[PDB]
Design a protein around this ligand. Structure first.
Ligand SMILES: Cc1cc2nc3c(=O)[nH]c(=O)nc-3n(C[C@H](O)[C@H](O)[C@H](O)COP(=O)(O)O)c2cc1C
Ligand code: SF4
Ligand code: SF4
Ligand code: SF4
Ligand code: SF4
Ligand code: FES
Ligand code: FES
Ligand SMILES: [Mg+2]
Lengths: 217, 230, 59, 42, 62, 431
């Protein structure tokens, strides 16, 4: 299945090197804290954190933001473009306020993840790669997100909503559009990856310090 | 001091750090390649140079694997031949049918190495990939559907010409080579990417369609446009 | 299958089929074909000279 | 008590939580090693 | 068409050795200019140099 | 001898399920950060010997002797920095154990980083965490700040005179960047394409310095092994497969969960006990993938008597991998599931080298035709051949892991492929 997103840039009035972008002073402090996590002479190691910070500030990554990151880090703009186009978490196009990312890999596909996707599509009236007319919600499919035992699940702006049902995801979307922030985590009454029937392990209080310590150690 | 390696059982003394490709070159065997250039850095991505070591269950990239003492390199073994055939099969599976309309024509490394090391038949029953063409100036014509993503132009551009405007955007089968922006790769050493590109993706624009390699007569002279004496 | 006088064909749209690839010139036993080409006004790979010496051709 | 989820601190984080934590950790760090040059292009 | 009046325009001979070619030219009486064979000089290659800690051989892309 | 029924007094990863406090106070209420200074004073050789005696193997895929790897990195200094890179790019489909460790035992992770760094003589440890786990990374940073404030890490760590730093690097979404050399390339602000070996990471790693890449579970279980023995850890498990393991049972199972068990527990017992068994009962089982997408599948016949173990699963034409147990019951489209896995591999392909790039796209297309029967039985052997041409001829192991599920499907469910092709031929010929 084709992604539908191109990997070439055409200048537009809404996206061109003259688009105004610059880091806030707080973000410049964050950048200067980030850069010195790496040895001297290897400032290029901060490309991913600085680009992520730029995306967090601006909402997405224009070519002006890419050029600004390249100028700040003294790295080639083509290298910045390579990183931005390689990594899929970077938005090179404007997205909605809430970026729903439904995981559709096999462990999530075995459970009714297609039901979750269809419920989202009917609730918002958009396709699997479109954005709501009020620029409020964007819906995409993604690969495994690391919460397979809590399938099916979605990610909406670095928050995991797990053990979902169509009613649960519809309620989450309603809460998001109302203004409230839903609590991330499983929606089936579980707190974490524990079995739903009951704890089959770690049922007794943990042993204290120095429990099975070696003689010499 | 020199270490003794073996190519097809023939002894050869090579300096430490010498590669399998260079050992075969010393014994007179040119291992097939698409991404390896001796003037450029080692990439090891086209995977065309895979050869078999006598006791190694796994094939090694001859362009990037330093030889060890007492290594026997089986250049014409069944595993090496099958590896070359598979790599060429992938290359031609995604390559386009442009040979007659392509200026690379009879001087193409893909054609020659397909005739010498690859199979004579295709098992690809799917559709092919078509790539949008870029524009990097009035000298180099780009038809990027023929690119095999060998990164010779990128490495040459950066290392030799000191210009870092070539690279790969995207990933996977959709990985593309270009500038990602409408930028002309203008430099005094821009035609050497035409030379080093093994395929017709990068071709001379002034020379386009004019002739074919077998017709041309070669006159070995020198250059007068400057005082280097090229 | 009869081999008589030569002809250059066209596509049904009227465009010439020949793409100046010089395979016929390369394969001609008697070297009866002379071909010279260049990019056209619209950028097509088309011939400017396509000669066949019918007194040299062996048909 | 082993019946309450104690990992509830993460329903408060914001966009810059990770980077603010990184900024706070700056004081505790140690001097970085140097390659002897400002950049590989130098 | 391209005309010619030189019989030896297309004549190219193949020899296994510079000495053999020189002997043939001398016994056939033509003048000759000899060009010494140019072989590429050996080059030291290393894939690990692409990631040097302190040298300029570190590459910015792969 | 039998294996399983691990005791809570012996489970390494307490606070799993997040039912206790994960802070420094909560971790210190358990055995975390106990005599760490004494371990550091005992030094590198003692820690390496303890790990070797424990016989721990890599917990993030290919199981290699961690003692051997850290001894590889135990060479004398040559004027360059030393780094431990902790892999937390849990991109394998089926795996959540690293997420649980990071979110619930970050101090265990940090103590393991310190112990491993002392063993390897490392100045710093970069924990490369995937960008989707933002809350997990934030909890990890909070725990690291607590450790720095308490003086457990930093200069004069634990009051031992050893300087050791712990940084957290958040990546973007790249299952290929999950790979160790791609991890290293991504840390350096590059695309994240795996390198060729040699040079090995223990000699030329991130920034060109000696680095050792180790899994979150491995480094987290290191300090527990150090404080305890390693005769104990070797006692848990088979002879060459020792210790405990985190299993993520998911899919068509009654109770999908993450649990800790012994390294040779039978798969049937694990599923029936910690996961409630298959949804329609054990007789409703169709196939199981025991190590995530990379490992092939096994039918119910193999799953009836098999041990969740490295060698045991190798003898079953499979692999343990990350011990991610995906269960598929009789009422599933196995061809569609394997095709979705292959599509995942097509999307999560770095595209650097020709075999994996072109062949994985080709296999994705062939499988997409297979799931609807729009193919011929003569293409099954062709698909097997192209999968074998991908495997072993690639720069990294993603190409190999993209062919093993195809090989497993072709090996165990060829009749289903042929029957679906026959059904499609009947459907289209009726027109
Ligand atoms: C979270 C994680 C993801 C990994 N993903 C991949 C992958 O996509 N491809 C691959 O070939 N190896 C992958 N690996 C394996 C690494 O290449 C390497 O073997 C491992 O990180 C070393 O850790 P260990 O010594 O604890 O096994 C992964 C490892 C981990 C821990
Ligand atoms: S690059 Fe080579 S193989 Fe490709 S169309 Fe041109 S001549 Fe043919
Ligand atoms: S354009 Fe040519 S030289 Fe550049 S990567 Fe493609 S095939 Fe190689
Ligand atoms: S050059 Fe000759 S062979 Fe080629 S397209 Fe023209 S007529 Fe055909
Ligand atoms: S096998 Fe695939 S993911 Fe690995 S280096 Fe090659 S192209 Fe990249
Ligand atoms: S398969 Fe969906 S979270 Fe892993
Ligand atoms: S020539 Fe060695 S992999 Fe390309
Ligand atoms: Mg060319």
């Amino acid at each position: 299945g084709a992604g539908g997103a191109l990997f070439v840039h055409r200048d537009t009035p809404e996206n061109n090197p003259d688009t105004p972008f610059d880091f806030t002073p707080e973000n410049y402090k964050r950048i200067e804290a980030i850069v010195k996590n790496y040895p001297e002479g290897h400032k290029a190691a901060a490309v991913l954190p600085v680009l992520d910070l730029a995306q967090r500030q601006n909402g997405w990554l224009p070519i002006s933001a890419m050029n600004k990151v390249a100028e700040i880090l003294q790295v080639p703009p083509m290298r910045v473009y390579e990183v931005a186009t390689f990594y899929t978490m970077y938005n090179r196009k404007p997205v909605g306020k809430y970026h729903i990312q439904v995981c559709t890999t096999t462990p999530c596909m075995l459970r009714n993840s297609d039901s979750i996707l269809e419920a989202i599509q009917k609730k918002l009236g958009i396709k699997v790669g479109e954005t709501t007319p009020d620029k409020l919600f964007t819906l995409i499919e993604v690969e495994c997100l690391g919460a397979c035992v809590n399938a099916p699940m979605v990610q909406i702006n670095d928050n995991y909503y797990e053990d979902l049902t169509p009613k649960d995801i519809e309620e989450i979307i309603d809460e998001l559009k109302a203004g409230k922030i839903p609590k991330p985590g499983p929606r089936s009454g579980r707190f974490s990856c524990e079995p739903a029937g009951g704890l089959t392990s770690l049922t007794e209080p943990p042993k204290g310090p120095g429990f099975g310590v070696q003689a010499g150690l | 001091n020199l270490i003794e390696v073996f190519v097809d059982g023939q002894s050869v003394m090579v300096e430490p750090g010498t590669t399998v490709l260079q050992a075969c070159e010393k014994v007179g065997m040119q291992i097939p390649r698409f991404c390896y250039h001796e003037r450029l850095s080692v990439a090891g991505n086209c995977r065309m140079c895979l050869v078999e070591i006598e006791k190694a269950p796994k094939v090694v990239a001859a362009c990037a694997m330093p030889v060890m003492k007492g290594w026997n390199i089986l250049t014409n073994s069944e595993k090496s031949k099958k590896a070359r055939e598979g790599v060429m099969e992938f290359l031609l599976a995604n390559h386009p049918l442009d040979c007659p309309i392509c200026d690379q024509g009879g001087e193409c490394d893909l054609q020659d190495q397909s005739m010498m090391f690859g199979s004579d038949r295709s098992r690809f029953l799917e559709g092919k990939r078509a790539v949008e063409d870029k524009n990097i100036g009035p000298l180099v014509k780009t038809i990027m559907t023929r690119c095999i993503q060998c990164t010779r132009c990128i490495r040459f551009a950066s290392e030799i010409a000191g210009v870092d405007d070539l690279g790969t955007t995207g990933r996977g089968n959709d990985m593309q080579v270009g500038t990602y922006i409408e930028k002309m790769f203008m430099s005094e050493l821009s035609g050497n990417i035409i030379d080093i590109c093994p395929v017709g993706a990068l071709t001379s624009k002034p020379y386009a369609f004019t002739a074919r390699p077998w017709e041309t007569r070669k006159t070995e002279s020198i250059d007068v446009m400057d005082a280097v004496g090229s | 299958r009869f081999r008589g006088e030569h002809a250059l064909r066209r596509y049904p749209s009227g465009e010439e089929r020949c793409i100046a690839c010089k395979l016929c010139e390369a394969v001609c036993p008697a070297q009866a074909i002379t071909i010279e080409a260049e990019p056209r006004a619209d950028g097509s790979r088309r011939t400017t000279r396509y000669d066949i010496d019918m007194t040299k051709c062996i048909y | 008590d082993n019946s309450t989820y104690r990992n509830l601190q993460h329903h408060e984080y914001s966009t810059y939580t990770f980077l603010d934590l990184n900024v706070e950790l700056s004081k505790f760090r140690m001097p970085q090693p140097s390659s002897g040059r400002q950049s590989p292009r130098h | 068409w391209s005309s010619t009046a030189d019989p030896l325009s297309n004549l190219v001979l193949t020899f296994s050795t510079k000495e053999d070619a020189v002997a043939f030219a001398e016994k056939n009486g033509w003048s000759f200019d000899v060009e010494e064979r140019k072989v590429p000089k050996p080059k030291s290659k290393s894939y690990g140099a692409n990631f040097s800690w302190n040298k300029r051989t570190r590459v910015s892309t792969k | 001898t039998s294996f399983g029924s691990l005791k809570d007094e012996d489970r390494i990863f307490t606070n799993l399920y997040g039912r206790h406090d994960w802070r420094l106070k909560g971790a210190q209420s358990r055995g975390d950060w106990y005599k760490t200074k004494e371990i550091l004073l005992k030094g590198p050789d003692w820690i390496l010997g303890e790990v070797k005696t424990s016989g721990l193997r890599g917990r993030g895929g290919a199981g290699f002797p961690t003692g051997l790897k850290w001894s590889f990195m135990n060479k004398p200094s040559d004027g360059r920095p030393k780094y431990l890179v902790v892999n937390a790019d849990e991109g394998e489909p089926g795996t959540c154990k690293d997420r649980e460790i990071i979110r619930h035992d970050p101090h265990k992770l940090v103590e393991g980083c310190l112990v491993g760094g002392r063993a390897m003589g490392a100045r710093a440890a970069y924990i490369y965490i995937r960008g989707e786990f933002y809350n997990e990374a934030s909890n990890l940073q909070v725990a690291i700040r607590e450790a720095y404030e308490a003086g457990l890490i930093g200069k004069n760590a634990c009051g031992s005179g050893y300087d050791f730093d712990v940084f957290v690097v958040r990546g973007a979404g790249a299952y290929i960047c999950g790979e160790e050399t791609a991890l290293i390339e991504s840390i350096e602000g590059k695309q994240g394409k795996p390198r060729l070996k040699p040079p090995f990471p223990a000699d030329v790693g991130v920034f060109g310095c000696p680095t050792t890449v180790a899994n979150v579970e491995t480094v987290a279980v290191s300090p527990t092994i150090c404080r305890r023995g390693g005769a104990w850890f070797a006692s848990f498990g088979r002879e060459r497969n020792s210790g405990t393991k985190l299993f993520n049972i998911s899919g068509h199972v009654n109770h999908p969960c993450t649990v800790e068990e012994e390294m040779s527990v039978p798969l049937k017992e694990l599923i029936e006990k910690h996961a409630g068994g298959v949804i329609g009962g054990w007789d409703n089982l169709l196939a199981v993938i025991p190590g995530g997408s990379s490992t092939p599948l096994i039918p119910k016949s193999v799953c009836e008597t098999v041990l969740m173990d490295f060698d045991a699963l190798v003898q079953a034409q499979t692999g343990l991998g990350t011990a991610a147990v995906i269960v598929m019951d009789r009422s599933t489209d196995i061809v569609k599931a394997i095709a979705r896995l292959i599509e995942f591999y097509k999307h999560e392909s770095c595209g650097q080298c020709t075999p994996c790039r072109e062949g994985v796209d080709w296999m994705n297309k062939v499988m997409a035709r297979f799931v609807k029967g729009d193919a011929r039985p003569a293409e099954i052997d062709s698909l097997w051949e192209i999968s074998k041409q991908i495997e072993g001829h690639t720069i990294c192991a993603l190409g190999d892991g993209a062919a093993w599920p195809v090989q497993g499907l072709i090996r165990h469910f060829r009749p289903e492929l042929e029957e679906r092709m026959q059904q499609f031929a009947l459907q289209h010929q009726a027109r």
